[PDB]
Amino acid sequence: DMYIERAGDITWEKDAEVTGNSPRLDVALDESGDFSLVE
Amino acid sequence: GETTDGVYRVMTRRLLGSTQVGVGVMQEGVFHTMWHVTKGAALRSGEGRLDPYWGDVKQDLVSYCGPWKLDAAWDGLSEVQLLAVPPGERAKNIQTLPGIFKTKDGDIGAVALDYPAGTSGSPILDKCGRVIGLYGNGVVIKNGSYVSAITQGKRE
């Protein structure tokens, strides 16, 4: 029996940590809403 | 109960202790999360009962107490931030340039940041603070890191 708890405001932070890469990926989306990698 | 615009954890007591199953956004009296987090179930907000209003398993989204309200888009150029809310850890902004999910229906934003599954439903923002979509539905690549979409709903 699920419940919610507030965790913060939705705000852009100046000088947040900047990270992660930017990959271009071929994918398919099935009727169950699962993404899969094509090739 | 609490209806303040902002970001929230989704918890269950049905397992060992209190377990965070995901994250969502409260905006204009409506709660937004991913379908896999709640599976369409009712939520509590203290003494309050939030009922599902709209949901679609294929989009992997669900809204509570009204129609989907978020209609901002990754503009394809500008950076973004994952306002990650990880299980038992403080909300933290992470800035990233999203990559791209090319599909037969079109192209979607993608972010290659590996957080625990209970981070599902954390919002992705643009530089004006607008929610451009939610984190947690994509693919695991060779590298072992999950790549999530930028999953965003249609406002009616």
Ligand SMILES: COc1cc(-c2ccccc2C(=O)Nc2cnn(C)c2)ccn1
């Ligand atoms: C083997 O795959 C994973 C994925 C995850 C994961 C990590 C971050 C955000 C979200 C998920 C996640 O579970 N997504 C998701 C979408 N739909 N379903 C049913 C589940 C963590 C561990 N293993």
